[PDB]
Design a protein around this ligand. Structure first.
Ligand SMILES: NC(=O)c1ccc[n+]([C@@H]2O[C@H](COP(=O)([O-])OP(=O)(O)OC[C@H]3O[C@@H](n4cnc5c(N)ncnc54)[C@H](OP(=O)(O)O)[C@@H]3O)[C@@H](O)[C@H]2O)c1
Ligand SMILES: NC(=O)c1ccc[n+]([C@@H]2O[C@H](COP(=O)([O-])OP(=O)(O)OC[C@H]3O[C@@H](n4cnc5c(N)ncnc54)[C@H](OP(=O)(O)O)[C@@H]3O)[C@@H](O)[C@H]2O)c1
Lengths: 545, 545
């Protein structure tokens, strides 16, 4: 019998290379497979050439037209799969796109910015939001449209990449939407676990092919690095050596067959004991799950810390919050630019700022991560006062509790709203501050960013986790890209920064703590190795005071 | 064809529940199995059972005698296996024994103590030392002997427990060695992986029996919680429910077959890519890898922080090291008991302390950790002096660098010495202080303990790493035992404490920085959530100063 005998399997991106190995292994294990592709012609071709190359019955292989980001197509596609076969025993979220292969400073956000990248003979065919919908959106959508038709003891397999947890210069667009999916897979496990549906996460390492060693050598050319630096990086993370392809034992890449044989194992009932589990098909590449630390001291700061420096604060709906952080920054003797998304809120706050009497060193302006063109202008304008922004604290876009609900249950707004405001806003802020610290590259101290999470929404911070994950990667890419550009002469000053997680603490005194430490990262001459830095549960206890 | 076709396996403790299951699946997938165990009569009876129950050719199975605590025994055993079949493809380190089932406070160290338990109708058969050798010794010795005869593409599998990273009540001698074994496997992952010998790590959850479901009713009785609390503890961690035993879907324990099927897979070439990997067959249990964080803060202290308080410092080989840590306490106004193993050191140190000018608040006494009856006696003499001991600080037993060499290429005595000195010293100091703080539950400040790592060996810190992950799980057991003893009104004062990792940083102040965070943890009113606290690489950078 076949380890997958009498099981309906759905494989997103079945036309691609791993796709077809998974389908091959599945048909040869006794599954009925439905192959999902954006195009019915390229997907049907990929289907028929698989029929040729295996010896399986036309009846045991099906295809269908699905595009994540178009939920109208994902419902119409699953439907056709339910009518046709009556259930989904195995989901394999393998669907994903390369993403714009540009550094953080040159990511195309608008369609005209992308058209403008096609005029420089580039191969990039995506916006950052296209890449999100294409990498992160498919998994989220397909999963939620499929979960109610997935019977007890069924399996979901979400195909990440090892590159989500490692530096991948000029690929901010590809990794952060994977890094998100990472936390989402875990959260989907927590919602579909009690229902008896397994959720498990495959991290394929760099995949062995003919192209790969040249694709890397090509990336090596990108950064002005001696060809082979990309490959050697990853080889040097690998602990395991192996003979593949009848070559000798060396540092090599894992195979498409290794990935397939895992998706056979994970799909099969042999794996029915595993949930929210990570499978790292990477030759034991040494990486950490979360490059983090919790704060074990009160942020002890002085009143001359910031003399000559100006912070930007990109605030969200809760401007009131932002201003509290602003306040402690001013208290350290730095200038502040509280950048609020509505102009409505620039009135209310500028006046309520006169009420408290914070007129010295603080300037409130409209600053809208939705529209970056103006975000650029606004920083040009502010610096004409002759002090340049030396550090940039970024708050979440949407008000706390704005995003809420089970990942499958959450509305068509939930994902699209989360993907656009939360992921694009972070990338736009990163591109915008990168572009600005390109121009004004002689600051008193090297430039420093800090991202900030919401406090605990107290519904289990489902969206707090996803965004911590995606942000943690965006910081790794940004730390790396700037450290490689700096060493090659292209910048004078290396951008560095951190992320502070508030949601591990529900105490009343948390914001002045969060904002306290925010100041230590920006204004003091520091480098914090760990990316994401958590606020302890109790602060009184965790520190001296 | 067999999924393990043409693979010589070696499964240690193959007579036990899982052992039978691993051999049964292995024979089905065409494996040639060598069963293993200290009792030949046992081993062979088992073999006969498995030869009937599975239609397996009696050629395709064999037995061999080996006690893991006894390396000679082990060298012989593999020698026959080698002689017979020529090589080892797969080595399953299933061998382990449930330790003494005794709470830290009542751990049996010397044979006489174990005999005092057996006249009590307790099922304890094992000293702490014995449990070490029975869980940790075996895995180390079987593997290191098997390695040479393992060809490339080879599989080592190490079977440990999830409970090695989660609290287990009065099961210190089970989980501590299981913890060392996790960190051992890691090192063996790295040392062999370059030879293409993959070394992965299975974490069984609670495994479905009739016995274990009552052993939780058993445990439940020892703490004094309602029966099914322990069941509901671990159930409450698991994200997955499942329909096992023909009972309707509910949170249920994983079957032995789930553990058996994984080895089939981990043994097989389908897993050619995975190395250093952890497989948790625990129904998606929610435990983190390690509860830890780096110090993003210089130790800030004050000159009265500890007046009226008293601190024990259990010293190892190198006492001058401990005496500088001791100066830092005294400086903070605490009193110091300096415990030195070798009675000769007492009068040597005594001079240095007058020469050095330290004469007030400091007492020096012989404090051998191989003599608890003496330890427990000396502490009572200091208490009679008039100040109870509020703070313990445990130094490593052996001199610096004395344990070295990659686990495989380790001297026969290096593993023996590491297990006895390091593991028993930590377990003994733990018992002795629990027993002392049971006797003195009315201290001015909660009682606080501090485990301090060696400084770097500058070689990878092989022993650094194993000894840390082990201590981390001793503390997690220590904290939870005092939490539950305090809640049920057995003890007024919650014991709590931390581990300080030093080997991460090489800087010249290194001793001062750790000696200073020891004083905080000891003499300040704080309860740090993270167990293991690392010194950061650069103290200049992490902390503004
Ligand atoms: N190969 C690697 O270097 C590597 C390394 C690590 C991880 N991975 C992961 O493996 C997956 C891809 O595997 P692969 O190497 O064989 O590449 P691939 O599958 O060729 O990737 C492109 C394919 O995915 C499908 N796809 C992409 N975006 C989609 C969307 N929004 N909606 C529907 N279908 C979509 C496309 O199908 P249609 O054209 O028919 O729509 C296309 O054939 C990705 O999820 C990736 O993160 C790959
Ligand atoms: N049951 C669970 O829920 C559970 C939970 C967590 C972890 N585990 C772990 O997974 C494995 C469980 O196997 P099991 O459930 O079948 O229990 P088990 O095998 O009955 O545990 C005892 C076995 O270990 C062997 N052993 C002990 N000391 C030894 C030594 N010095 N030399 C050689 N062999 C020795 C014994 O072999 P002989 O008596 O034949 O010499 C015996 O077969 C163990 O490693 C255990 O630590 C089990």
């Amino acid at each position: 019998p076949g380890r997958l005998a009498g099981k309906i399997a759905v494989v997103t991106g079945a036309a691609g290379n791993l796709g077809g190995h998974i389908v091959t292994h599945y048909l040869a294990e006794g599954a009925t497979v439905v192959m999902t592709g954006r195009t019915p012609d390229r997907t049907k071709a990929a289907a028929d050439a698989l029929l040729k190359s295996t010896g399986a019955d036309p009846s045991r292989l099906a295809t269908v037209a699905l595009d994540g980001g178009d939920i109208a197509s994902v419902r119409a596609a699953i439907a056709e799969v339910v009518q046709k076969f009556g259930r989904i025993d195995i989901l394999v979220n393998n669907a994903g796109s390369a993403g714009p292969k540009q550094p953080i400073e040159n990511l195309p956000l608008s369609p005209e910015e992308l058209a403008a990248l096609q005029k420089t003979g580039s191969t990039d065919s995506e916006t950052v939001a296209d890449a999100l919908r294409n990498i992160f959106g498919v998994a989220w959508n397909v999963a939620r449209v499929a979960a109610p038709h997935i019977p007890e003891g069924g399996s979901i397999i979400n195909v990440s990449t090892i590159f989500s947890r490692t530096p991948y210069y000029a690929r901010a667009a590809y990794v952060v939407p994977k890094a998100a999916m990472n936390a989402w897979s875990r959260e989907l496990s927590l919602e579909l676990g009690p229902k008896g549906i397994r959720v498990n996460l495959v991290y394929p390492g760099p995949i062995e092919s003919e192209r790969i060693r040249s694709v890397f050598a090509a990336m090596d050319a990108a950064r002005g690095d001696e060809a082979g630096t990309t490959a050697t990086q990853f080889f040097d993370m690998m602990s395991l050596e192996r003979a593949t392809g009848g070559n000798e034992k060396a540092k090599t890449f894992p195979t498409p067959e290794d990935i397939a044989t895992t998706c056979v194992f994970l799909g099969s009932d042999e794996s029915a004991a595993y949930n929210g589990h990570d499978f790292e098909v990477t030759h034991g590449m040494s990486v950490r799950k979360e490059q983090r630390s919790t704060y074990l001291a009160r942020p002890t700061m002085r009143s001359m810390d910031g003399t000559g420096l100006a912070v930007l604060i990109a605030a969200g709906d809760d401007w009131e919050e932002a201003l509290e952080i602003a306040q402690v920054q001013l208290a350290c003797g730095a200038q502040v630019v509280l950048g609020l998304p509505r102009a409505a809120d620039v009135a209310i706050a500028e006046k309520r700022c006169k009420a408290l009497g914070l007129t010295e060193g603080l300037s409130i302006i409209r600053f809208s991560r939705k529209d970056p063109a103006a975000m650029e202008a606004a920083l040009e304008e502010y610096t004409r006062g002759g002090t340049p922004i030396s550090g940039a604290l970024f708050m979440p876009a949407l008000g706390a509790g704005e995003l809420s609900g089970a990942v499958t249950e959450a509305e068509d707004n939930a994902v699209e709203a989360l993907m656009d405001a939360e992921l694009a806003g972070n990338m736009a802020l990163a591109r915008t501050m990168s572009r600005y610290w390109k121009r004004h590259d002689n600051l008193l101290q090297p430039p420093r960013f800090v991202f900030v999470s919401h406090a605990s929404d107290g519904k289990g911070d489902i969206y707090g986790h996803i965004l911590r994950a995606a942000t943690e990667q965006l910081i790794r890419i940004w730390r790396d890209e700037s450290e490689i550009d700096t060493a090659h002469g292209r910048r004078r000053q290396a951008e560095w920064g951190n992320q502070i997680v508030r949601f591990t603490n529900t105490e009343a005194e948390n914001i002045r703590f969060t904002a306290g430490h925010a100041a230590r990262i920006l204004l003091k001459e520091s480098k914090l190795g760990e990316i994401t830095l958590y606020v302890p549960a109790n602060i009184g206890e965790a520190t001296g005071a």
